[PDB]
RNA sequence: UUGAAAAAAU
RNA sequence: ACGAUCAGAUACCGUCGUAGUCCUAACUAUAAACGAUGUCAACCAAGGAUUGGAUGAAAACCUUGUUCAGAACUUAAAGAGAAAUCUUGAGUUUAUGGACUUCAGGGGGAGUAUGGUCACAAGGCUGAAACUUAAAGGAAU
């Protein structure tokens, strides 16, 4: 095949992840049931290296977590875009 | 002073995308800047935009989605004949399959692939990867 | 859905956090921590939102629980400040997560030739200001980090930040106590409808 | 090249400043570039204040102190051990 | 700033703080 | 910024979102030309040149706009 | 043999098959024996053997610095540097660093998608120090139009057609190869139009087999 | 008759330097109680240093 | 308080 | 001009002292005249403090919040660069084009010769060539 692989896409910046990027992470948030016990199913978030080193990863993720429903009111309404 | 409003807007959009910002703001909005965005919107490089009227050539808010690499203006708009296209494409665009030029022709503000189809030349406005 | 109804903070948990003045923070406010701050106190100090503290607390515990539910040793809990040494040590006891007690020897995540070289997949730090070294080494091993950040600390190389007081003896012990209990609840090894046997005083320094 | 960001002076938004005189040499040095030191000393040293108070013609005289402000050129400052050649990183320290 | 906020719909308080010409639609502070 | 000095003042009147001589005042030039007694005032002898260069720009424009008569010329 | 890393453990028992499986998830290669397992038959090239010196009280302490470029011609390459007191040790030391510094090379077509890949996909520029190297895609027939120093490296990376334009002090070879390797190294970070698609949900090998390596 | 004075600090004052404006200074121009100018600035060290 | 100088190529 | 020191001292060191140092009038037009950083405009991370207004509270001066303009400072894992370092740019540049003006082309010869012009003068401005030579130089170890 022409491509060597399909590179990951950062969930925060919607930009590619380098093969030499050793600051990028991968946060897995398992789904929880009505009882409140984790499940083998999970959703994967990827954050680029340069995002972390600025102080933005924590706030950027809260935008994604709140959108996906893992948080309820952490991020105010006027800060969601 | 502000010689070129288009240059100021494109350089503002490029800076925001490098920082990974979700949206940008352009203070003086013209018809040429609005029409330049439609070429970028038709290629899905930017989500959309909102021309807010302020009675003073109102501002613009542009939504970006992690796709634009660089959009740049070109200083004085050179008259580009149809035979001078691939000379300009071979300079300003990274590859034959990726980039996109913008020309202000008599048939509106078109890109290179549809000004060639429309069979017209014109002054060159800028480009965007 | 994603945040079911079994996850509100029960009145017991809120009662102790105000008692341990968890919501009470420092004076200088980092820009990245403005969202968690609700209002400024009477002598110009930040007051964290208790709900925002809990929502981030559970979310951090959920991430730890998933990673630590099959490989407990793949979680590392570092704690530099002498105050948080006991609480970090009990967190290790009840979950199996490795916990570096005192000084963090630089290169313990990068130098493979080291005898004490550990390669985790998640790192929990007690204080980003004191444990900046551990956070910086993560940026070399692609390992996400979780911090008990305060209103003045720098949020560089932290992904999940829990806004809580990380200087007082009570709050340091209490928050680690809640994190351990929440992790066990997600694991299913501790029912949500019962009371945890171990009291907070065990975690206290 | 540039050993200092402020070029050793303390002048930012002006063009000229009056000269002063080095206290040990008399060299003309600019006011902002001068090494400024303030000295408060008793007129009577500790080795003699006992004798002065002993046979004193007054009841509750409080001995005075001098107040002189000294300015040195850089060459006289270093040689006089007022200031030292600090480390390359210690140069930035301003306390 | 680094913590990005919405631009199209500014908060009610935020437009009160900013300079009169720097609001989304410049309005005077007089009557 | 300003026309001559490097100042950058942005104070402006703010017309709301609802729609429901200067050349004469610049002749200031007379007042400074005070200069007859303070002959050594090299400052006011410079700020007068700045004022007079402004007048030669407003005259140059009011003639193009066909406002002033074509024979106009400022002089003492 | 007997690796000391989590990823290195997976490779030895044949759990990670392809090298690119490592490259997708950014897992750092910390043992050179891993590359020799998933990349057999790596061709060898030695670029230069330059001697540095250090003035001492007694005399000059000379050490020999060796640049070696490694990589198979199927889109993988790496460059390593090592200085030591002996020539044999310098090449062996640089051998290891070259393998640890492996980087995938993205290549595409010039104008038509007629197999197989020959040239770089877009315009790339690598910035070492004063030396800057720019790679331009070229048609099928054109070889590697470049200086003898990066042409040796570009052969190993498996790029047959390319147009190069160089700027800076190219007479220093250390920066010339590093600037070439720096150009290729970022070939996969340039998000073109065809890479817009998010892609399916995958799993890191260090997470798929996390329970297995625990014992 | 020569008089001297100095602008003083304040109990709650935080900034180190307490200078008066040029416009403010011209307003201030056996016991010296001159001080109550306390409606113009804060003054503490008021003396008569010479009489000729 | 005084302390000047050290041929060319290796 | 003397007296010291010295091999010598026409110098630093000490003493005396003409022009000069001050003002007025007319010239001169150069400085390491420096931020060695042209003018104008757009964007641009975090923080404390300060000069002058405006605006709320706190009973002109002080304490606090917003905002405008000015001289500055601190941090960067980021951007640039050869590096020192720069960040209110020296960033947004082989992914090269915002507008305009001036200047430079290895080191000497040389800001020299000649021509022109300005000045009472010293001098300033414009300003080469023959010839000579593999280096001259910048930042850091």
**Distance in angstroms (rounded) separating the CA atoms of residues C68 and C183:** 9
Q: Residue G108: which of G35, G19, G192 has the closest Cα?
A: G192
Close Cβ partners of C169 (under 8 Å, ≥ 6 residues apart): C83, C204, C205
- For residue A3, give how far its alpha carbon lies from the nearest alpha carbon of chain C (Å): 24
Q: Report the C-alpha gap between G114 and E19 in whole angstroms.
A: 60
Angstrom distance (rounded) from CA C141 to CA C139: 6
CA–CA dist C138, C128 (Å, integer): 12
| DSSP category for residue C7 | G
CA separation for the pair G206, G76 (Å, rounded): 22
Query: Which among G212, A31, A25 is positioned nearest to C63, based on CA atoms?
Result: A31
Q: Would you state the structure tokens that stand for residue G200, as one six-digit string?
A: 């399916």
C-alpha dihedral (C26, C27, C28, C33), degrees to nearest 10: 50
Give A34→chain G minimum CA distance, Å.
Answer: 25
CB contact under 8 A, C139 and A49: yes
Element (H, E) at B26: strand B23-26
Residue A59, CB, less than 7 Å from strand J?
A: no
Beta bridge mates, D67: D40
Cβ within 8 Å of residue G152, ≥6 positions away: G45, G47, G69
Cis peptide before G67 (omega within 30 of 0): no
List, in order, residues 6 or more apart from G202 with CB less than 8 Å away: A8, G24
- Minimum CA–C1' distance nucleotide for B78: J97
The verdict on B23 touching A (C-beta cutoff 8 Å) is yes
Among C183, C74, C163, which residue's Cα sits nearest to residue A30?
Answer: C183
CA distance A12 to B66: 9
C67-73: long-range contacts, CB 8 A cutoff, minimum separation 24: C67/A28, C67/C121, C67/C122, C68/C95, C68/C96, C68/C97, C68/C122, C68/C183, C68/C187, C69/A38, C69/C187, C70/G210, C70/G211, C70/G214, C71/C121, C71/G210, C71/G211, C71/G214, C72/C96, C72/C97, C73/C97, C73/C98, C73/C120, C73/G214
- Nearest-Cα residue of chain E relative to residue F14: E28
Give, as one character, the DSSP assignment of residue A16.
B
Residue G56 CB-density burial (10 A; 0-12 exposed, 13-18 middle, 19+ buried): exposed
Interface contact A80-E6, CB threshold 8 A: yes
For residue G81, CA distances in Å to B99, C29, G65, G101 come to 37, 46, 7, 10
- Which residue out of G188, G200, G205 would a mutagenesis test of the A interface target, given it has the greatest number of A Cβ atoms within 10 Å? G188
CB atoms C112 and G5 under 8 Å: yes
Find the radius of gyration of the CA atoms of chain E. 10
User: Cα separation of H43 and H35, whole Å?
Assistant: 6
Q: Is the minimum CB–CB distance between E8 and chain B shorter than 8 Å?
A: yes
- Bases of chain J below 7 A from a protein C-beta are 24-25, 35-37, 39-53, 60-78, 80-86, 90-99, 138-140
- CB contact (8 A) between residue G193 and residue B98: yes
CB contact under 8 A, A15 and B23: no
Check if the beta carbon of residue H10 is closer than 8 Å to that of residue H43: no
Q: Report the half-sphere exposure of B19 (CA within 13 A, side-chain side).
A: 17
Residues of E with CB below 8 A from A55's CB?
A: 2
Chain G nearest C-alpha distance from C108 (Å): 13
* Chain A residues whose beta carbon lies within 8 Å of the beta carbon of residue C4: 32-34, 36
Question: Which nt sits closest to B16, CA to C1'?
Answer: J43
Q: Which residues contact C54 (CB under 8 A, 6 or more apart)?
A: C9, C13, C14
Whether nucleic acid strand J comes within 7 Å of the CB of F42, the answer is no
- Largest Cα–Cα distance in chain C? 53
- Residue C182 CB: number of other CB atoms within 10 A? 25
**Alpha-carbon distance A31 to C62, whole Å?**
9
Q: In sequence order, what E strands does C43-90 have?
A: 46-48, 75-78
Compare CB distances from A56 to E2, E9, E11 and report the shortest one's residue: E2
User: Which residues are registered as beta bridge partners of G48?
Assistant: G67
How many residues comprise chain G? 215
Q: Tell me which DSSP letter residue H7 carries.
A: B
Residues 45-74 of F with CB under 8 A from E: none
DSSP C153-169: S--TT-SEE--S--SSH
Q: Which residues contact C126 (CB under 8 A, 6 or more apart)?
A: C77, C78, C79, C80, C81, C84, C87, C88, C148, C166, C172, C176
Q: What angle do CA B8, B11, B16 make, to 5 degrees?
A: 125
Q: For residue E11, list chain A residues with Cβ-Cβ distance below 8 A.
A: 78
Task: Kindly tell me the number of DSSP H helices and DSSP E strands found in chain B.
Answer: 4, 8
Q: Which residues contact G191 (CB under 8 A, 6 or more apart)?
A: A15, A16, B66, B67, B69
Interchain pair B98, G196: CB under 8 A: no
What's the CA gap between C183 and C146, in Å, rounded? 14
Helix (H) / strand (E) element for B115: namely: helix B112-118
Would you state the structure tokens that stand for residue G44, as one six-digit string? 């060898």
| Residue C121 touches partner G, C-beta closer than 8 Å | yes
B–F interface: beta-carbon pairs under 8 A: 3
- How far apart are alpha carbons B24 and E4 in whole angstroms? 10
Q: Between vectors from CA G20 to CA G19 and to CA G24, what angle results, nearest 5°?
A: 135
Å from C82 (CA) to J81 (C1')? 44
* E2 shares contact with chain A (CB less than 8 Å): yes
Neighbours of A49 (CB within 10 A): 20
Q: Which residues pair with G103 in a beta bridge?
A: G77
Phi then psi for residue E27, to 5 deg, are -130, 145
Side-chain-side CA neighbours of residue F37 (13 Å) = 3
Question: Taking CA F12 as the corner, what is the angle to CA F7 and CA F18, rounded to the nearest 5 degrees?
Answer: 160
Residue A62: closest CA among B28, C161, F47: C161
d(CA B70, CA B14): 6
CB atoms within 10 A of CB A37: 17
For D90, the 3-state DSSP assignment is helix
- Partners of A12 on chain B (C-beta within 8 Å) are 20
* Partner-chain contact B25 E7, CB within 8 Å: yes
- With a CB cutoff of 8 Å and minimum separation 6, the contacts of C74 are C67, C68, C120, C121, C122, G210, G214
Of B20, B22, B66, which has the smallest distance from its Cβ to A81's Cβ? B22
- Collapse the DSSP code of D79 into the 3-class scheme (helix H, G, I; strand E, B; otherwise coil) and give the result: helix
For F48, the enclosing helix (H) or strand (E) is helix F44-64
Q: Alpha-carbon distance D88 to D86, whole Å? A: 7
Chain B, residues 64-123, CB within 8 A of chain E, namely none
To one decimal, the resolution in angstroms is 3.2
Q: Which of residues 5-34 of H touch strand J (CB under 7 A)?
A: 7, 10, 12-15, 17-21, 24
CA D25 → C1' J23, Å? Answer: 31
Cβ-contact B99, B69 below 8 angstroms: no
CA geometry: angle at G40 spanning G37 and G42, to 5°? Answer: 120
Residues 6+ apart with CB under 8 A from B27: B59
In chain C, count of helices (H) and strands (E)? 5, 6
Give G50's contacts (C-beta < 8 A, 6+ positions apart): G64, G65, G66, G67, G173, G174
Q: Catalogue the long-range contacts made by H15-22 (C-beta closer than 8 Å, 24 or more residues apart).
A: H18/H42
Judging contacts by C-beta atoms under 8 Å, the chain C residues touching residue G210 are: 70-71, 74, 121
CA distances from E10 to A26, A79, B46, E7, E24 (A): 33, 10, 22, 6, 8
At residue H47, φ and ψ (nearest 5 deg) are -140, 165
User: What does the alpha-carbon distance between residue C157 and residue C99 come to, in Å, rounded to a whole number?
Assistant: 19
C-alpha to C-alpha distance for D51 and G192, rounded to whole angstroms: 92
Residues in chain A with CB shorter than 8 Å from the CB of E10 are: 78
Residue G3, C-beta contacts closer than 8 angstroms, at least 6 positions apart: G9, G11, G12, G31, G33, G34
Instruction: State whether residue B18 sits within 8 Å of chain E by CB.
Output: no
- CB-facing half-sphere around the CA of F34: CA atoms within 13 A: 12
Q: β-pairing, B122-128 with B100-105?
A: antiparallel
Give the CA B41 to C1' J135 distance in Å: 58
Q: Is residue E16 within 8 Å of residue B32, measured between CB atoms?
A: no
Q: Is A51 on the interface with B (CB under 8 A)?
A: yes
Kindly determine whether residue F17 and residue E27, on different chains, have CB atoms separated by under 8 Å. Answer: yes
Residue of B78, B108, B109, B107 whose CA lies nearest to B92:
B78
The residue among B6, B1, B2 whose CA lies nearest residue B77 is B6
Size of interface A-G (CB pairs under 8 A): 58
From the CA of E13 to the C1' of J37: give the distance in Å.
Answer: 42
G45/A51 Cα distance (integer angstroms): 37
Q: What are the C-alpha distances in Å from C31 to residues C151, C152, C205, D91, F4?
A: 9, 9, 31, 31, 40
The Å distance, CA of C120 to C1' of I1, is 73
Q: Does F2 touch chain E (CB under 8 A)?
A: no
CA separation for the pair C167, C46 (Å, rounded)? 14
G30 → closest Cβ in C70, C71, C112:
C112
Q: How far is the CA of G168 from the C1' of J139 (A)?
A: 17
DSSP assignment string, E1-31? --S---SSS--HHHHHHS-GGGSSS---S--
């Amino acid at each position: 095949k022409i491509e060597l692989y399909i590179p990951r896409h950062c969930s925060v910046t919607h930009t590619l992840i380098a093969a030499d990027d050793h600051a990028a992470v991968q946060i897995l948030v398992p789904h929880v049931n009505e009882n409140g016990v984790i499940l083998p199913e999970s959703t994967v978030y990827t954050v680029k290296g340069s995002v972390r080193k600025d102080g933005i990863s924590d706030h950027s993720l809260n935008r994604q977590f709140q959108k996906d429903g893992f948080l309820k009111t952490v991020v105010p309404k006027n800060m969601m875009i | 002073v502000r010689v070129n409003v288009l240059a100021d807007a494109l350089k503002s959009i490029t800076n925001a995308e490098k920082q990974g910002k979700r949206q940008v703001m352009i203070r003086p909005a013209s018809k040429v800047i609005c029409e330049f965005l439609n070429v970028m919107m038709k290629h899905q490089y930017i989500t959309d935009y909102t021309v807010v009227d302020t009675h003073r050539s109102g501002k613009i808010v542009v939504n970006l989605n992690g796709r634009l690499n660089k959009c740049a203006v070109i200083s004085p708009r050179f008259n580009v004949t149809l035979s001078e296209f691939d000379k300009w494409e071979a300079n300003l665009l990274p590859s034959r399959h990726f980039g996109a030029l913008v020309l202000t022709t008599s048939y509106g503000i078109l890109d290179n692939t549809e000004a060639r189809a429309k069979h017209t030349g014109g002054r060159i406005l800028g480009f965007f990867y | 859905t994603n945040f079911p109804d079994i996850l509100k903070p029960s009145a017991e948990d809120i009662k102790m956090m105000v008692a341990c003045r968890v919501h009470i923070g420092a004076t200088n406010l980092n820009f990245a921590m403005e969202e968690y701050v609700y209002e400024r106190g009477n002598n110009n100090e930040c007051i964290f939102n208790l709900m925002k503290t809990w929502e981030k607390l559970s979310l951090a515990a959920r991430v730890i629980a998933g990673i630590s539910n099959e490989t407990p040793s793949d979680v590392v809990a570092v704690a530099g400040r002498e105050m948080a040494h006991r609480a970090s040590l009990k967190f290790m006891k009840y979950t199996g997560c490795t916990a570096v007690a005192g000084r963090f020897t630089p290169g313990s995540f990068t130098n493979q030739i080291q005898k004490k070289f550990m390669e985790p997949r998640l790192i929990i730090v007690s204080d980003p200001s004191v444990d900046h070294q551990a956070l910086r080494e993560s940026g070399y091993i692609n390992v996400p980090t979780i911090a008990f950040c305060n209103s003045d600390n720098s949020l560089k190389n932290v992904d999940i930040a829990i806004p809580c007081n990380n200087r007082s003896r009570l709050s340091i012990g209490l928050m680690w106590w809640m994190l351990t209990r929440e992790i066990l609840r997600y694991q299913g090894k501790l029912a949500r409808d019962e009371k945890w046997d171990v009291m907070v005083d065990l975690f206290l320094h | 090249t540039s050993k200092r960001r402020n070029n050793g002076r303390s002048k930012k938004g002006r063009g000229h400043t009056q000269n002063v005189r080095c206290s040990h040499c008399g060299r003309c040095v600019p006011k902002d570039k001068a090494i400024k030191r303030y000295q408060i000393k008793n007129i009577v040293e500790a080795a003699a204040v006992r004798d002065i108070s002993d046979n004193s013609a007054l009841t509750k005289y409080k001995l005075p102190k001098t107040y002189m402000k000294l300015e040195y050129c850089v060459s006289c400052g270093i040689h006089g051990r007022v200031v030292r050649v600090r480390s390359r990183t210690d140069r930035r320290n301003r306390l | 700033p680094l913590i990005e906020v919405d631009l199209l719909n500014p908060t009610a308080a935020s437009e009160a703080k900013a300079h009169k010409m720097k609001r989304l639609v410049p309005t005077p502070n007089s009557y | 910024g300003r026309m001559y000095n490097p100042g950058r003042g942005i104070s402006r009147r703010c017309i709301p979102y609802r729609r429901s001589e200067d050349l004469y005042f610049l002749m200031r030039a007379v007042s400074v030309r005070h200069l007859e007694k303070n002959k050594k005032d090299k400052d006011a002898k410079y700020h007068l040149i700045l004022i007079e260069s402004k007048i030669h720009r407003l005259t140059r424009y009011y003639k193009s706009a066909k406002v002033l008569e074509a024979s106009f010329k400022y002089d003492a | 043999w007997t690796p000391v890393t989590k990823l290195g453990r997976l490779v030895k028992d044949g759990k990670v098959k392809s090298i690119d499986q490592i490259f997708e998830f950014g897992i750092k290669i910390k043992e050179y024996q891993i590359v020799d397992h998933l990349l057999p038959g790596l061709k060898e090239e030695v670029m230069t053997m330059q001697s540095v010196q250090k003035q001492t009280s007694a005399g000059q302490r000379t050490r020999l610095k060796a640049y070696v470029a490694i990589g198979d011609h199927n889109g993988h390459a790496g460059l390593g540097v090592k200085c030591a007191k002996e020539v044999a040790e310098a090449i062996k030391g640089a051998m290891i660093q070259a393998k640890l510094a492996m980087v995938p090379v993205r290549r595409g077509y010039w104008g038509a998608t007629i197999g197989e890949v020959h040239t770089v996909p877009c315009k790339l520029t690598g910035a070492c120090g004063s030396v800057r190297v720019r790679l331009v895609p070229a048609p099928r027939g054109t070889g590697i139009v470049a200086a003898p120093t990066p042409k040796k490296f570009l052969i190993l990376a498996g790029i047959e057609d390319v147009f190069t334009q160089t700027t800076g002090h190219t007479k220093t070879l250390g920066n010339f190869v590093k600037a070439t390797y720096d150009a290729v190294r970022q070939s996969y970070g340039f998000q073109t139009k065809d890479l817009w698609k998010v892609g399916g949900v995958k799993q890191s090998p260090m997470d798929k087999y996390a329970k297995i390596l625990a014992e | 008759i020569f008089c001297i004075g100095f602008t003083s600090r304040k109990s709650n004052q935080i900034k180190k330097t307490s200078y008066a404006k040029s416009a403010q200074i011209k307003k201030i121009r056996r016991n010296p109680k001159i001080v109550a100018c306390s409606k113009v600035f804060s003054m503490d060290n008021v003396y008569i240093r010479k009489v000729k």
